[PDB]
Design a protein around this ligand. Sequence first.
Ligand code: NAP
Lengths: 284, 289
Amino acid sequence: KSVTVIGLGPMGQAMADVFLEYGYSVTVWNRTSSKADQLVAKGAIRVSTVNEALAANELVILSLTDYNVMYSILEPVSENLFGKVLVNLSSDTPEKARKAAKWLEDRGARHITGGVQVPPSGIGKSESYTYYSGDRVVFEAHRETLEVLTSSDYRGEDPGLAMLYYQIQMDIFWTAMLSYLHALAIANANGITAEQFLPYASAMMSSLPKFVEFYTPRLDEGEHPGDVDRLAMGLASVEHVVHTTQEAGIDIALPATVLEVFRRGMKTGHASDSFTSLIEIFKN
Amino acid sequence: AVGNRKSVTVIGLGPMGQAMADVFLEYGYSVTVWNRTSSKADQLVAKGAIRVSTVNEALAANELVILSLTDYNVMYSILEPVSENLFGKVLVNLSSDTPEKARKAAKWLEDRGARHITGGVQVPPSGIGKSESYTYYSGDRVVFEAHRETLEVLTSSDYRGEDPGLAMLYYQIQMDIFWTAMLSYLHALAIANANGITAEQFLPYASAMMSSLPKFVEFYTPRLDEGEHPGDVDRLAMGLASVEHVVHTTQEAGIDIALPATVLEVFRRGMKTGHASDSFTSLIEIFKN
Ligand SMILES: NC(=O)c1ccc[n+]([C@@H]2O[C@H](COP(=O)([O-])OP(=O)(O)OC[C@H]3O[C@@H](n4cnc5c(N)ncnc54)[C@H](OP(=O)(O)O)[C@@H]3O)[C@@H](O)[C@H]2O)c1
C-alpha cells in the first residue's frame, strides 16, 4: 500500500488524505511545496523534486490542473519514466488524453485516464464513480488502489474514452440546464414562479430517457423514418417556442440556435424524416 | 338531471381531431364534425359521426365546440366569416400556439359572445382517451368546470388558472426544454459516434444524466424564487471552464459547434456582466435581458 500523488490542489489533497486514512504510504510533490504542509502533518512524505516523487512508487496519480502541466514537469525528466504507471485526472478532451498516453508510452511508461465524476468531498465514498480508460491489464493491476478513492467504471482501451464519456454527459448537462433557465425566464415573464414550474420541468426531464431509449436502436441502424414524427412538424413546434420567447421579451439566442439546426436539416432534404436526422447536421 | 349533454362538435380533423372524435363516439357522444378536407371524416362517418358541410352548421349543432387546428390564424380564417353565429358557444381550442395568441383569441371570441378555454394537449393521437394523459387548461374557471366532464373523456385535465395564455405558457416552456435537451443528446451522440462509440453504448449514460437533472432543478428552485445566485456550491467561472472543454471536444471530433458555442456565449455574457463568483443560475439574468 504505497502511492505517489503529484499535484496538491483540492482534489490531490482529498485523495492523498483518503490514502493516508486507509493506511497507504503516500509520497507527494507540488511546485509550491507549502501546499503539502497539512498532509505532511498527517504522515505524507513530501519530496523536493519530481525525480524523487517518480522514484518512490510504480503508481503515480497526476491531479494536475491540465495536461500541459504534465509535459512541463515530465518532459525534462523523460529518462526516468520507465515502468511507471501515470493516472491522469486532468479534465480535458479525448485527443489530449490520447496524445499524452502515446508520449508516455514512448518513454516506457503506461497511462490510465481518469474522469472523476465528483468534487473533492466525494473522494473516499463508494457511491462516487470515476471513468477509467487505457490498457485493461494495466488498469486491472491498479484497480484495488484506485477503488480506495471511488468506485470505478472502466470504459475501454482507448485512453480518450474516460474523457469522452465525461464530456458528452456535460454537453447534455449544460445545454439542458440552460434550457431550464431559459424556460423559467419565459415563465417568470408570464407571472409563474420556479416553485409552480418545478413539477412540470421535472416531469419533462424525467421523460427524456424514454425518448432516448426509443430512438437508440434506430440511430444505431442509421434509420430516421418519419413513422412517429416528422422534422417539418418539429420545426413548426420550435417556431412556436421562438415566438413565445420573443413575445415574453426573453433572449432568443438559445432557441434561435435550435431553430437554425432544424432549418439546416430541412434545407438538406429531411422534411419527411424523423428529427433524429438532425444528427447528420451535427456530423457536419 | 345532472351531467353534460352527450353532444359535441369537433372542428379540425387532422390526426388529433380524428382521435378526439373517435374517443367521443366510442364513449357514446353524438359527434358532429367539419373539416376543410371533408373526406378525412370518412372513417368517422362509418362509425357514426355526423359530417356537416359548412362551419356554420358545425357551430349550430352544439354549444360545446372543440377545435383542433394547426394554429390560431386558422381559427380566424374559418370563424371570422361566421362571426355572427358564435354567440352562446363554448370554444375549447386545443391548437398549439403562443400565450399571447391565445389571449388575443379569447378576447376576440368574448367580443362575439362566445366563451374560450385554452388547452395544451401533452400527448400524441394515441394518448387520447387514456387517463394517464394530461392536457393543460386555462381560461374562465366557471366555463371550464361546466365542461370538465366532457374534456375528461379525452384526457385528464390540469387546470392552470384564469389567464387564457397559461395553458400555452406551460405547454411551450416544456417544449423549450424538450427540443433543446433532445438536440443536446443528438449533439453529444454525434461526438460519441465520431469517437467510435454507438448510441447503445451511450444509452445508460445519457439516461442517467437526464434523470439526474430534476435533483438540480429541485435544489435551485427556492434560490431562483428569491432571486439569489450565491456561489456557495458552484461558481460560473468553473462552469465556463467546463463548457469550454465541451466546445474543444466538439471541435476535435469535427462536430458542428453551433449549439455548444451558443451555450458558451451565454456563459461569457454572464462573466462579462460580473457573475464569475455567482452560481451559474445567474445566467437567468442574461435570459431576462
Ligand atoms: N399530432 C400531434 O402529435 C400533436 C400533439 C399535441 C398537440 N398537437 C397540436 O394539435 C393541433 C392539430 O394538429 P394535427 O396533427 O391533428 O393536424 P394538422 O395537420 O395541424 O391539421 C389540423 C387541422 O387544421 C386544419 N387546417 C390547417 N390549415 C387550415 C386552413 N388554412 N383552413 C382551414 N383548416 C385548416 C386541417 O385541415 P385539413 O385536414 O383540411 O388539412 C386540419 O383539420 C396542432 O396545433 C398540433 O401542434 C399535435
